[PDB]
Each structure stands twice: as C-alpha cells, then as structure tokens.
Amino acid sequence: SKQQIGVVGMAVMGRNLALNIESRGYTVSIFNRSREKTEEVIAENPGKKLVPYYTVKEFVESLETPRRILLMVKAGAGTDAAIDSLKPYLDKGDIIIDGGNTFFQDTIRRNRELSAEGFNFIGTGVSGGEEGALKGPSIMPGGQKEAYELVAPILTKIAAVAEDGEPCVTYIGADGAGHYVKMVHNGIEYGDMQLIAEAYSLLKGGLNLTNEELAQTFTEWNNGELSSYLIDITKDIFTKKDEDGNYLVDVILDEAANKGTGKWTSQSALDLGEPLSLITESVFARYISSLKDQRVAASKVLSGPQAQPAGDKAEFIEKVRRALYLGKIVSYAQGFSQLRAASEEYNWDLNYGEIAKIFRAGCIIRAQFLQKITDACAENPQIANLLLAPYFKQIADDYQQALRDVVAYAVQNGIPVPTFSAAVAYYDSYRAAVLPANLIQAQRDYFGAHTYKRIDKEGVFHTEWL
Amino acid sequence: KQQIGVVGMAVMGRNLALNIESRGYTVSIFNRSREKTEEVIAENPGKKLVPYYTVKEFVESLETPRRILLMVKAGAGTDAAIDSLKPYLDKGDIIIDGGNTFFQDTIRRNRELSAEGFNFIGTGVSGGEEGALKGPSIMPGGQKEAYELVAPILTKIAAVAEDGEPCVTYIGADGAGHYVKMVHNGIEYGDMQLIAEAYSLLKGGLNLTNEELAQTFTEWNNGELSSYLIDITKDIFTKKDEDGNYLVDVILDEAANKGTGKWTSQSALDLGEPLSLITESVFARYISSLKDQRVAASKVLSGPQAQPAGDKAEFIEKVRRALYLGKIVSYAQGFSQLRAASEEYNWDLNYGEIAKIFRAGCIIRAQFLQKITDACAENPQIANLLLAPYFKQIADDYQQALRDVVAYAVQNGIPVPTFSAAVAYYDSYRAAVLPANLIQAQRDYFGAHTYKRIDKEGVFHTEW
Numbered sequence: 025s026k027q028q029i030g031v032v033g034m035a036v037m038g039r040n041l042a043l044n045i046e047s048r049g050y051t052v053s054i055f056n057r058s059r060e061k062t063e064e065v066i067a068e069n070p071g072k073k074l075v076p077y078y079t080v081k082e083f084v085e086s087l088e089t090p091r092r093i094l095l096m097v098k099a100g101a102g103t104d105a106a107i108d109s110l111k112p113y114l115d116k117g118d119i120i121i122d123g124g125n126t127f128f129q130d131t132i133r134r135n136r137e138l139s140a141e142g143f144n145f146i147g148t149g150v151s152g153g154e155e156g157a158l159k160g161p162s163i164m165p166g167g168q169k170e171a172y173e174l175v176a177p178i179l180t181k182i183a184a185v186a187e188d189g190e191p192c193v194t195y196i197g198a199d200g201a202g203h204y205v206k207m208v209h210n211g212i213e214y215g216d217m218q219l220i221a222e223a224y225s226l227l228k229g230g231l232n233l234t235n236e237e238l239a240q241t242f243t244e245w246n247n248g249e250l251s252s253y254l255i256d257i258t259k260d261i262f263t264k265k266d267e268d269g270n271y272l273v274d275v276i277l278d279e280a281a282n283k284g285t286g287k288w289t290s291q292s293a294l295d296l297g298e299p300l301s302l303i304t305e306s307v308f309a310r311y312i313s314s315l316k317d318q319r320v321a322a323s324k325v326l327s328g329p330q331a332q333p334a335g336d337k338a339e340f341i342e343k344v345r346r347a348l349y350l351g352k353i354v355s356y357a358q359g360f361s362q363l364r365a366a367s368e369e370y371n372w373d374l375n376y377g378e379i380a381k382i383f384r385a386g387c388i389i390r391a392q393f394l395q396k397i398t399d400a401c402a403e404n405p406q407i408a409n410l411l412l413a414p415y416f417k418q419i420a421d422d423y424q425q426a427l428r429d430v431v432a433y434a435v436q437n438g439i440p441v442p443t444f445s446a447a448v449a450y451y452d453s454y455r456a457a458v459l460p461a462n463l464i465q466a467q468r469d470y471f472g473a474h475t476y477k478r479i480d481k482e483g484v485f486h487t488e489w490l
Numbered sequence: 491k492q493q494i495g496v497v498g499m500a501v502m503g504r505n506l507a508l509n510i511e512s513r514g515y516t517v518s519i520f521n522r523s524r525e526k527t528e529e530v531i532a533e534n535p536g537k538k539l540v541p542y543y544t545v546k547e548f549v550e551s552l553e554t555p556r557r558i559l560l561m562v563k564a565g566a567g568t569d570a571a572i573d574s575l576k577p578y579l580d581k582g583d584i585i586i587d588g589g590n591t592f593f594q595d596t597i598r599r600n601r602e603l604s605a606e607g608f609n610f611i612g613t614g615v616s617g618g619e620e621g622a623l624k625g626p627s628i629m630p631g632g633q634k635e636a637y638e639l640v641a642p643i644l645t646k647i648a649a650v651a652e653d654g655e656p657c658v659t660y661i662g663a664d665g666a667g668h669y670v671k672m673v674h675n676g677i678e679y680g681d682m683q684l685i686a687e688a689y690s691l692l693k694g695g696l697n698l699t700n701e702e703l704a705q706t707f708t709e710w711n712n713g714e715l716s717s718y719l720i721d722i723t724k725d726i727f728t729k730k731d732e733d734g735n736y737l738v739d740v741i742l743d744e745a746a747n748k749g750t751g752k753w754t755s756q757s758a759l760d761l762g763e764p765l766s767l768i769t770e771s772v773f774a775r776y777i778s779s780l781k782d783q784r785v786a787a788s789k790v791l792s793g794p795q796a797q798p799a800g801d802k803a804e805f806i807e808k809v810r811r812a813l814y815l816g817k818i819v820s821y822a823q824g825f826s827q828l829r830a831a832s833e834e835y836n837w838d839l840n841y842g843e844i845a846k847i848f849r850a851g852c853i854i855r856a857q858f859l860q861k862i863t864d865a866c867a868e869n870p871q872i873a874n875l876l877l878a879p880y881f882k883q884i885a886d887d888y889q890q891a892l893r894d895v896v897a898y899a900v901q902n903g904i905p906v907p908t909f910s911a912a913v914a915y916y917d918s919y920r921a922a923v924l925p926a927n928l929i930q931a932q933r934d935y936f937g938a939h940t941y942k943r944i945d946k947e948g949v950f951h952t953e954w
C-alpha cells in the first residue's frame with residue numbers, strides 16, 4: 025500500500041500540517057532527518073493514518089505517483105539539502121511543495137532548476153501558527169499555474185475558510201511570488217505586534233493600568249473595529265499566571281527574538297525604493313530589545329523625564345485606541361504599496377484584493393480589517409496607496425488628531441513610540457506636495473555636482489553656488 | 491619609472507592623479523578609452539603626467555612593488571580592469587580600488603588576488619570631485635604591509651585636520667575601508683535629513699525668509715554645530731536665481747541617490763543593529779521620489795496647519811538643540827554599527843582613528859568629530875557614544891528641546907522622521923524594560939517559540 029501525500033519535516037508546523045492533511049481523510053507518509061522526532065509524532069498520535077519512514081528512499085517509494093511531497097523544513101541550507109536528497113528517487117512529473125519560510129529569491133532559483141528537471145514545483149507560504157497549521161492556515165502558493173492546479177484540491181482541503189465560505193488559498197503568481205507574499209505577511213505581523221506593544225507602553229506608562237485593566241481594555245478593543253487575532257490573544261496573555269501566582273507577562277524577559285522575514289521585508293523595501301518605515305522600525309525595535317545588557321547599563325546613566333499627567337482616563341484610552349488603529353492603517357498602506365512595487369519588479373501581476381482576502385482567516389494577522397482592504401482593492405484594483413481609499417482616508421481624517429496627541433504625550437513622557445511616530449511622519453510626508461528634498465538636491469549639487477531639476481523648465485542643471 | 495599609476499580618467503581618477511602630481515610625483519595614467527587620456531594631457535600642460543595607451547606599457551612604467559590606483563566606476567568595470575592587469579603584474583604588486591565599492595566585493599577581490607600573489611586595497615575616497623583634487627579623506631583596507639608601502643603617497647594627498655594629522659589611516663583588513671566609506675555615506679544621508687527637518691521647522695513654523703534661514707544657519711555654524719554641511723546650507727539659502735529670486739525654491743524636491751544609499755541600512759539589518767535614523771533618512775529620500783503620488787495624495791488627504799510657534803528666539807534655539815542631539819543619536823547608532831561590523835568581519839577597528847580621518851576632507855567633516863575622537867581615546871571600546879560623559883551631558887541638557895520640537899511638529903503636520911527616530915531611540919536605549927515581553931508572550935502563544943524569564947534560567951513554553 026502507498027500513501028497519498030508525504031510531509032518532510034516534523035517540527036511543530038510540519039507535524040501539524042501532516043495532521044491537518046490526515047484529518048481531511050488522506051493517508052500521509054512522514055519523514056524527518058532527526059528520526060527520534062518522527063517516532064515521537066507516531067507515539068503521540070495513535071489512531072491517525074500517518075505512516076513513518078526512516079530513510080528518504082523508503083519515504084519516496086511509499087508515495088502514489090505522481091508524488092506529492094510537502095517540505096516544512098528549516099529555511100536555507102536545510103531545505104536545499106532536503107530537496108537534493110529527494111531528487112535521485114523521484115520520477116519526472118513528481119510534485120514538490122516547499123511550504124517553509126523560504127527567501128523568495130531562493131524560490132525563484134529553485135523553481136527554475138526543478139522545472140527544467142521536469143518536476144512540478146510550488147513555493148508556498150503557510151501562515152497560522154501551531155493552531156492554524158493544524159486546523160486551517162492561510163496558504164499562498166507561487167509557481168507555474170499548471171503546478172498549482174495539480175495541488176489546489178488538497179491545498180483547498182487544508183486551508184482556513186473565511187466566514188463567507190471562501191478558502192484562504194489562491195494562486196498568487198509565478199515563481200517566488202507566494203514566498204514574497206508570505207514575507208510581507210510576516211513583516212506586517214511584526215508591525216502589528218510592535219503597534220500593540222506601543223499601546224501597552226502607553227496604557228501602562230500613562231495610566232498605570234494593572235494587568236487586569238490592560239486585559240479589560242484589550243477585550244473592549246477586540247469587540248470593535250480593532251478585532252483581530254493578535255488583539256484577542258493579547259487580552260488573554262494579560263491575565264495568565266504561572267504555577268506560583270506571577271503574571272507571566274511580568275516575568276518574561278523583554279528580548280524579542282526573530283527568524284528573519286522581518287529583516288527580509290525591510291531589506292526588500294530598501295532594494296525597491298519603498299518607504300516602509302513602520303515595519304522597519306518594528307524590526308529595529310526587536311533589535312534594540314535584544315541589546316538587554318546595554319539597555320540595563322544605559323538606564324543607570326542616561327537621564328529622562330517622568331510620565332506626564334494623562335488627563336481623563338477614558339479619553340486617554342480612546343486616543344490610544346484611535347492611534348493604534350490609524351497606525352495599523354499606515355503600516356498596511358506601506359506594505360500593500362511594497363507588494364505593488366515587488367509585483368512590478370518581479371513581473372507577477374499580483375491581485376492585491378485576493379491577497380487581502382486570504383488573510384481574513386488562518387493567518388496571524390487575521391482580522392475584519394482585512395475585509396476593508398479587500399473591498400478597497402475590489403473597487404480600485406490598481407489603487408496606489410490604501411490611504412486614498414474613502415474608508416481609510418476618512419478614518420485618517422477622524423483619528424489623526426488622537427494619533428498626534430498620543431505621540432506628543434509619549435515624547436513628553438519619555439515613552440518610546442517608534443511606530444506611532446513613524447506613522448505620523450509618513451502620513452505628513454506622503455500628503456506633502458513639497459518636501460525639503462529641494463535642499464538635499466541643492467546640497468548634492470554643491471558638494472558633488474550631481475545636478476538637479478527645476479519646477480519651471482526642462483532639463484538638468486548645475487550651479488556655482490558661491 | 492613612476493612610483494604610482496592611475497587607471498580610469500573619468501573625473502575622480504584624473505583629479506586624484508593631479509593631486510598626487512601636485513605633491514611632487516610623476517604619474518602614469520591610462521584609460522580604457524584613448525580619448526579621455528588624451529583630453530587630460532592637453533588640459534594640464536607642464537604637469538608630470540605620463541600617458542600610456544596600452545595596459546602592458548602602463549604596468550611596465552611602474553616601479554615595483556607596483557602601486558596602481560584604480561578609479562574606474564565601481565561595478566563590473568572593476569573586475570575587467572583587474573582582469574586586464576593580472577597578466578602583467580608581479581607577485582607583490584598592489585591594486586588600490588578607490589571606487590565607492592560594496593565591501594563584500596572588495597572582500598572577494600582581496601581573497602582572489604591574494605591567492606594569485608597580488609595585494610588589493612579597497613579604499614574609500616570622500617570629498618567630492620573637488621576633494622579628490624585638493625585633499626580627500628582616504629579610508630583604505632587590505633594588506634597592512636601594502637598599505638604601509640603606499641602610505642607616504644597617501645599621507646601627502648589627504649586632507650589635514652586641525653592638529654596637523656593627515657585624514658588617512660590603515661582601517662583594517664580586506665573590505666574594512668570600503669565598509670567605513672559606506673558608513674560615512676549613511677551618516678551623510680542622516681545629517682542631510684536632520685538639516686532638512688530643521689529647515690522644515692523654521693520655514694513652516696516661524697515662516698523665516700531665506701535670508702533669515704541663512705542668518706540662522708550662519709549663527710549655528712559658529713558654535714558646536716560647526717560643519718561643512720551647515721556652512722554650505724547657509725550659502726544655498728543666500729543664492730539668487732539670475733532674476734532676483736532664490737534658486738533653492740525652484741529645485742524639484744525629488745532626492746536621488748543612485749542605488750547605493752541603502753547599503754548602510756541593509757548592513758544594519760543583517761547585523762542586528764537598530765540604525766533607525768540613517769534608515770529613516772533613506773526612506774525620506776524614497777518618499778520624495780514618489781512625487782506623483784505625493785501630489786495626488788495632497789489633493790485628497792487632510793491635515794492640521796502649523797501651530798503658534800511662540801517666542802521666535804526660543805523656537806530657533808530649541809530647533810538648534812534638537813538638530814545637535816539628533817546628530818549625536820545618528821552617530822551613536824552608526825558607531826555602534828561599526829563595532830558590530832568589526833566583530834562580524836574580524837577587523838579590530840579603531841573607532842577613534844576613524845573619527846579622526848572624518849575631521850576634514852570628507853562631506854561630514856565638522857568640529858563634532860573631535861568630540862567622538864575624544865570619547866574613543868578615553869574609552870576605545872565604549873559600547874555606545876551616548877555613554878560618554880560629553881554626550882550624556884548634551885542629552886541631559888537638550889532632550890527637552892528635542893521633545894518640544896517633535897511635539898510641535900506632530901501637532902503642526904510637519905514631518906520629522908529623523909527627529910522622531912532620535913527621541914524613540916534615546917527613550918528605548920535607556921529603557922531597562924521594553925514591551926518586548928508582550929511580543930515574546932505572543933510569539934510563544936501562537937508559534938510555541940519559547941521565552942526566557944527574568945527570575946529563572948532556561949527556555950520556557952506556556953500552554954496558553
């Protein structure tokens with residue numbers, strides 16, 4: 025007997041994807057380079073149609089042809105090694121799906137090489153954390169359309185489904201487009217978590233709310249326009265205690281770790297000429313959190329102010345709420361503008377409304393907010409920036425004063441607000457018909473004879489400033 | 491024979507050649523295009539410049555160990571020029587690439603050439619076309635022995651600081667010099683953006699005329715802010731268009747850079763360094779380049795107008811203080827990046843010596859660099875310039891002005907990305923506890939990533 029699909033990589037996401045597939049009625053072969061993990065999965069899941077393999081040769085031979093193999097291995101060297109191991113055992117026409125968090129340029133190279141060798145390849149993002157991998161993640165596949173059609177049925181079976189019944193999987197585009205979209209999802213996730221962290225800093229620093237009051241505040245916010253998976257889990261985190269009675273949030277070390285897709289999104293913004301300030305400041309905020317020993321030392325020598333009077337409690341809470349929602353809007357406007365720049369550079373003809381649609385459920389950034397983006401893109405598929413869409417434009421009209429008030433309060437109080445700060449600076453630069461870049465261009469001409477253009481005549485000019 | 495030859499007669503190369511000749515040396519010059527070489531000779535009669543029209547004759551014209559300064563445009567024309575030189579070189583010869591080359595390419599070339607018995611010095615040269623001619627800041631990395639062999643020539647063509655010291659020094663091995671040149675360029679983008687925000691605040695908040703802006707920048711240039719960029723800025727505000735109007739007001743506000751301004755920030759991202767100010771400066775150029783989008787958005791989006799500025803002299807002083815403290819933060823971030831790069835690429839950089847060669851010749855030259863040199867002399871392995879006594883004092887005295895300026899700008903609709911980043915960085919770096927505890931809790935909740943605790947050792951995971 026042979027199984028229908030095989031999964032390589034039994035760390036949590038891959039094991040949970042295998043169990044997700046088996047839960048839809050499929051029989052699944054599994055393999056992992058560290059064999060003891062495969063034994064663990066079998067011991068922990070008696071009764072499920074998972075069949076373990078302990079060599080790659082036997083794993084491949086166990087699959088119905090054309091084979092469908094999903095790889096969920098560590099990005100980079102590990103993924104290339106897994107593919108190189110499978111190759112000698114495959115038949116032309118076999119289907120390889122790389123669902124790891126792979127850098128998109130690696131997928132463009134791999135798609136080229138494997139398609140030339142006659143394999144059907146799909147590089148796909150998978151988002152949803154441990155629970156979404158098990159129950160239904162967002163799935164963003166790229167590659168040749170013929171390859172996607174060979175796996176669309178199974179990907180649809182395992183993907184999350186939106187409340188309107190639409191599966192959270194769709195063909196993203198050619199070659200590396202799917203892994204590029206997964207990277208941008210992770211960059212947006214970094215930005216949403218830093219925005220929430222700044223709201224927490226503001227409520228705790230400005231109002232001295234207790235953890236119970238922070239949980240109540242996030243619960244109320246989750247009942248309105250801010251409802252999202254990240255705010256829903258935050259409200260839970262603030263009441264969790266350990267075996268001794270300590271709130272976990274207060275004993276967890278404030279050193280935010282990362283696995284790269286945050287840095288990759290920002291490095292891509294820098295390559296594409298996109299001003300992706302909010303997600304990039306979120307990466308830098310994780311980086312400075314990781315300099316804990318330096319911060320502890322500096323906290324003992326550098327001076328600063330104390331928090332200023334916050335005024336009426338409910339009014340302050342509502343301003344922070346409005347600052348957080350408008351901050352999100354600015355972060356996503358920057359992220360979707362980057363998706364357009366990447367689509368143009370890499371020739372993907374991305375469908376932005378469809379990307380937002382698959383993020384309505386499954387993924388970590390899931391929220392009703394994604395329907396607001398889906399609808400703005402449906403109305404204007406090539407909209408240049410979400411801030412121009414009526415819904416977003418009007419929220420900015422209504423909420424920008426709260427955001428400005430919150431940033432001024434935080435700065436006077438010494439509470440760091442890198443992303444709320446960045447959101448104001450971006451909104452005020454994007455709407456500015458004239459910026460002080462005229463001076464920067466005059467300086468470059470002065471010290472380096474770089475030439476500049478004029479607003480009243482054609483051509484390039486160079487001046488003797490003295 | 492000549493002690494040194496220059497390859498590439500575009501403007502930078504020809505100027506370097508004239509600088510060297512100006513010091514008393516005879517210089518062999520060569521160029522891929524016979525024309526430019528011919529053009530150069532004509533323009534400077536009497537200057538000892540010996541032209542060669544073949545790479546072979548060019549190389550044989552040089553005293554061993556040969557010193558060949560390569561000033562072709564950083565790109566693929568560099569590997570082409572080296573490819574053409576190799577067959578005529580002898581073991582021990584030295585190729586010196588003065589292009590604005592990406593440091594990883596210099597690391598590759600230095601490794602490849604060494605294996606073939608040739609030395610390779612990748613060097614930054616800062617100062618502009620004019621600086622190259624009169625005295626640039628020179629930042630060379632590669633084999634130290636090769637550097638010491640050509641150092642007599644470099645020390646005579648470099649700019650000189652107040653204390654008489656030439657603005658050149660051995661930076662470190664392989665690509666260390668081109669890495670430092672890159673960071674100098676990142677710091678230059680940060681200084682220009684900080685000045686641009688000060689201009690925005692003075693013009694939008696106080697409605698200063700160009701004459702008043704020039705007067706203000708002149709006064710600032712007399713004190714601690716003294717710098718080449720502030721000196722040229724007051725000249726720009728004084729420059730009138732041939733019709734009595736100011737030229738800066740008709741320049742298109744689309745800031746270029748040419749695909750290289752992003753390198754410092756990309757390296758910060760690779761090294762784990764929070765280089766927010768310089769990076770926001772690159773993003774400010776990127777958004778200025780999206781002019782069609784900005785004009786479209788300006789017809790749709792709403793915002794506040796400038797708020798009452800209050801006393802004029804007080805407002806100007808607060809902006810001055812904000813500018814100086816913002817520069818301190820930008821350099822603190824940049825020197826911390828130099829330490830992380832030194833560790834990653836194994837260079838054992840001397841930070842005080844790097845600050846010393848930036849005192850003159852380069853675009854960021856300013857009195858300020860001496861304060862950094864002083865701090866590094868006292869403490870060569872200082873983790874961050876904010877910890878040095880002089881800088882901690884300025885931050886204690888000027889932070890309130892910076893905070894007042896950012897709050898004013900935000901209420902007024904005036905974008906201040908780098909002043910904003912400076913406050914956020916200062917308030918994050920001094921914070922013993924940040925809200926990253928919630929981020930770690932979230933990562934453990936949704937992806938079981940585990941977390942550390944402040945009261946126990948080890949990695950923990952919670953069934954949330």
Ligand SMILES: O=C[C@H](O)[C@@H](O)[C@H](O)[C@H](O)CO
Nearest residue numbers: 153210213281282283933937
């Ligand atoms: O937050 C950063 C995590 O290190 C990173 O791994 C991703 O966010 C991942 O998608 C979580 O599953």
